[PDB]
Subunit: 107 residues, 3 copies
């Protein structure tokens, strides 16, 4: 998948987590979020199509994506421990990082 | 998973997409298809077991697998946008690329 | 996800496989197990936090993780062929490798 194809996957999975009832539904959706970032970190968003791979703007994008995989991993551990409530709470903060990263490179 | 283990995963997920009702069912199955190709592109099919990694026959296999991940990504974006109909239509063309690649290296 | 976050994912997915009714439920959970190992093989467990990357104890961990991905792949192929019974049987042996690896680096 390209960049925004996995970005929209993160957005939809956040909508699945907010309506998920058990911990298995939250965990599987969070792993789909981690998976969507596993193949999209290597892709390039539309705005940075003509930015150097060593350009600080393109470098910012990689690390901003690295925070995302880090927060997703923390919510996965909370959902893995059975804390379905605290994992959904961590998913609401994930929604902030996903939306901020998605709007900065949407164009 | 080995090569044909993920090939049969693509075939079964295509059967899940053709019977999927909502867009979330199509998107998750398509990401399972992208995931099945993410770890099987690095594996080697049975026929090419004794073919050089730089052999044009083995090289053909890698690129033919690269088309597959590209088509899967396009269907993921269609399913991510909510176009459950057009994503299923793209999945039927995916069935052509999966079956052609699966039969050429099945043996 | 970090190391134990994916370790607990393997444990929960084993509980999903033992209660899965059809072959698609077993296959998807097994691919979640393969996915959980795809990003956790590159992480480091708590005990080996201060062990050299070329240390035989840290080297043992990588190969012990490599057996895990190999067994998961074999159960995926059994579940892909439709053998839902034999794949669940392979999942019970997977439970031995997961639990042995999980307890050796849990601390
Ligand atoms: Ca609900
Ligand atoms: Ca149906
Ligand atoms: Ca049951
Ligand atoms: Fe990878």
């Amino acid at each position: 998948a390209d960049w925004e194809a996995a970005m929209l996957t993160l957005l939809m999975m956040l909508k699945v987590i907010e309506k998920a009832d058990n911990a298995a539904q939250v965990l599987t959706a969070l792993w789909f979020m981690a998976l969507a970032a596993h193949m999209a970190a290597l892709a390039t968003p539309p705005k940075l199509e003509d930015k150097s791979p060593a350009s600080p703007e393109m470098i910012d994008f990689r690390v901003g994506f690295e925070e995302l995989a880090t927060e997703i991993g923390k919510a996965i551990k909370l959902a893995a421990l059975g804390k379905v409530k605290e994992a959904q709470a961590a998913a609401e903060q994930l929604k902030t990082t996903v939306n901020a990263h998605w709007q900065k490179y949407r164009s």
